[PDB]
Design a protein around this ligand. Structure first.
Ligand SMILES: Cc1c(CCC(=O)O)c2cc(Br)ccc2n1C(=O)c1ccccc1
Ligand SMILES: Cc1c(CCC(=O)O)c2cc(Br)ccc2n1C(=O)c1ccccc1
Lengths: 403, 403
């Protein structure tokens, strides 16, 4: 028995899953393309028409599911969309991340792009969770991508409006709904920020390989409203983790105003290569070199540096570098600027530096930059936030978001 | 009136254009989606079957036209694809260009990208012309993109093969058909290069604002076969023109094996920012600083450097720079490396230079590099080709294509 509703065809025996509101998703064909078919019931025909329009308006982007067509029966309405190979959930739940390279982060970056695309179209998803974040089929050359799905609970903000009342009840799924949506009072109407919070938890769900910032399933929602976030899978003294901690912590704040935008999250160091990181260090040092001590830039860079530098950075580096630096007298052990200024000098002159000092630093640029991030795991986080005072400047545009 | 073929609807009174073999294109809609439908007559039903299938294997790429569906009638066959705003022909022939800034080169880079994608899928267009390059309908934010269409005459190379016999006549338009396609004296059958020759003409067509590298319309195909190419639109002593010459002259090469691949074209200086050119001069200089004069790299950089440096480059730079460099007699005016190094030095210590030598150089980075490209209009093209000996080096990966 093969169901043929117009250009869509599927066999009822091939069920890919069950959805809510009696929606059943089969595997089928459309225009000889492999698609997933969704049967919707008359009780939901209206909810399905809005999802298709919001899909038609965004599937162009590579990180949004591709909507194809819709055919109607005397009994059902069928939605044909691009056939994937797995959800992010089964991915986090069943891949050997050790063999998986930097894929997990690029999946997080792609999902973030999709969100910024949707937010550029005044579309809020409201139901972002690892289940409806899909993994594309492997392409002709063997690559996969992440795409956003389940547009049933999406909302297009009204022209000229930048929030949305809580009239659609409490859209979303327990454990991933931001507090404003579930809180009994209405200090302010929700907005795009409810998506970041969901996204923040998802970032952690991937980098923890299964954990949630707000506890286990049954107590999540109650912790979310109570503010009981715990990012335990992230060391406090690891460079990578300290950077992730900064981002995810900002993404799951209780005040949705203090939550970053998706365009900001795309620029975050959490996504930077080592080559880029070292580059950010070089440019900060050059911008501050002739900045006075009374200047705001330098005063923000040095507020709280003693902990960043670990009291005295000269007492925390390798002996071959300590001796090399002792040759002159131009770097203070308490200055985070001078630590960055030292990194600039020892990079420029790297080739004309004694082999013993070259061997402690490592090859450029990856081993060089790691030398200083492992020793001072708060250096990038501290200086990134400090240098925000120069996000308008052309030189720094590659690191912040500032239209 | 309006003809409704299944989910495709159009009005015969809305004709967008006419093709070959009686194929008419109307403006229409598919699934509430503004599309352009194609009416295909019976003698041509098989050409569409191929095009549709090929389109379904590559339409995903942002710069390859998006194909939606295809229905059939009692006597006709219809094909609905993305509706565009113009073709590159109309864009070139009817756009100020003075207020278009750099949009035209972004277009050339986009059609290249889509063509590299098609080649990665073992597909040769074989009929690339400013007519098949359509411009996107403006976005939800006012941006456009170029795309490739007219896949009817495309060729999916046999499995493992990297060439194709001329068994299907000579597909393509008089004026854009590569010479290997028409001649019988050729021993080598055509490959993907045949698409690069055509693109190399379009490249020139766009920068010349309509002109062709092989003359006027009727004598064009005649001139192509004879190798008589003329790019008089490009000055022989202007930095920008020298670069575009180097690339175009290699894409329209008479010998197919001398033509850059699509991925090669994508890295050519023709597409670099001003800052990227500085970064190239800096990396080239830094890389050759500790290289033996007897070394192959140095011997290739100076092979012909006399015309490049215009004899003593110290005598072709502004006087203020001439005085500030007179103290260093290390710089040999007949060395291109010495010129590149003098640039590297002027860039690093730019802030500590006397104001006279700073305002004669210009604001970093754009005006600084222009100081040398305008004065030495062969410096880049000379260095880029000679330094190919280092294309394999990670340092230079941003600048060349290896694998
Ligand atoms: C696109 C798609 C949907 C629709 C998503 C939406 O629009 O909400 C889907 C639903 C279920 Br249940 C089950 C599978 C579904 N699937 C897939 O292709 C797919 C997902 C995981 C593994 C293999 C294939
Ligand atoms: C999508 C599209 C097609 C189909 C391309 C194909 O056959 O692959 C088309 C054909 C002609 Br003729 C003419 C126009 C065509 N057009 C356009 O949107 C368009 C292009 C330029 C100016 C105005 C509209």
């Amino acid at each position: 028995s093969v169901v043929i509703v117009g250009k869509i065809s599927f066999c009822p025996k091939d069920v890919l899953g069950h959805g809510a509101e009696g929606t059943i998703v089969y595997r089928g064909m459309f225009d000889n393309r492999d698609v997933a078919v969704k049967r919707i019931l008359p009780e939901c025909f209206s909810f399905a028409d809005r999802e298709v329009q919001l899909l038609r308006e965004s599937d162009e982007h590579p990180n949004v599911i591709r909507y194809f067509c819709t055919e109607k029966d005397r009994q059902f309405q069928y939605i044909a969309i691009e056939l994937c190979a797995a959800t992010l959930q089964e991915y986090v739940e069943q891949k050997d991340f050790a063999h998986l390279g930097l894929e997990p982060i690029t999946l997080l970056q792609q999902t973030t792009s999709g969100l910024a695309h949707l937010h550029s179209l005044n579309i809020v998803h409201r139901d972002l969770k690892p289940h409806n974040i899909l993994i594309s089929m492997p392409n002709a050359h063997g690559k996969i991508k992440a795409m956003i799905s389940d547009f049933g609970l999406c909302k297009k903000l009204a022209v000229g409006r930048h929030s949305f009342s809580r009239r659609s009840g409490v859209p979303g799924t327990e454990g991933w709904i931001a507090p404003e949506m579930l809180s009994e009072d209405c200090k302010e109407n929700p907005t795009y920020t409810v998506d970041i919070f969901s996204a923040g938890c998802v970032f952690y769900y991937v980098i923890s390989e299964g954990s949630h910032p707000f506890g286990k399933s049954l107590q999540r929602q109650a912790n979310i409203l109570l503010g009981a976030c715990s990012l335990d899978c992230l060391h406090p003294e690891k460079h990578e983790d300290v950077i992730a901690r900064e981002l995810i912590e900002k993404m799951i704040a209780m005040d949705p105003q203090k939550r970053p935008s998706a365009k900001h999250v795309l620029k975050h160091p959490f996504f930077w290569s080592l080559e880029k990181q070292l580059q950010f260090f070089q440019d900060v040092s050059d911008r501050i070199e002739k900045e006075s001590l009374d200047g705001p830039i330098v005063k923000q860079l040095e507020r709280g540096g003693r902990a960043v530098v670990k009291m005295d950075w000269r007492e925390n580096i390798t002996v071959p570098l300590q001796t090399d630096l002792r040759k002159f007298r131009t770097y203070k052990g308490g200055s985070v600027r001078d630590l960055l200024r030292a990194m600039r000098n020892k990079k420029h002159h790297y080739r004309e530096l004694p082999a013993e000092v070259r061997e402690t630093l490592g090859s450029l640029p990856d081993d060089f930059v790691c030398y200083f991030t492992s020793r001072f795991p708060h250096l990038l986080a501290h200086t990134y936030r400090a240098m925000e005072l120069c996000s308008h400047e052309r030189l720094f545009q590659p690191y912040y978001f500032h239209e």
